[PDB]
Amino acid sequence: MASDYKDDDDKLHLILLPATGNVAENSPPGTSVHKFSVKLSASLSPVIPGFPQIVNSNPLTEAFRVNWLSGTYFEVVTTGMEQLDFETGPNIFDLQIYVKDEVGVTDLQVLTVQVTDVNEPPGGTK
Ligand SMILES: [Ca+2]
Ligand SMILES: [Ca+2]
Ligand SMILES: [Ca+2]
User: How many CB atoms lie within 10 A of CB 79?
Assistant: First the structure.
């Protein structure tokens, strides 16, 4: 009926199956965690600034954003409103990302973000 039908073949989909992310704790500011690509639409029309979209996240975590590098290439950037601390406890969170083109294409995916403990500098507060 529909499930048997290859619905994916006759529709546009993102390049690089989603989705994983991993950075060395919150040590690097504004450093991309992972990059994802989108298949070129037949229309190939340009998209407005702020490529769609972050719909949800697994709490408690605030330090991520979407960076549209160009055309159909983008990556998630770390260190936003607040920084992430390993000592807090949580090390992984899933981000529900919604993707929409100008033509009206749609796709929802989950992006896991991992936090890795980073060693403090040899010099610092005594
Ligand atoms: Ca740590
Ligand atoms: Ca630390
Ligand atoms: Ca450490």
Answer: 17
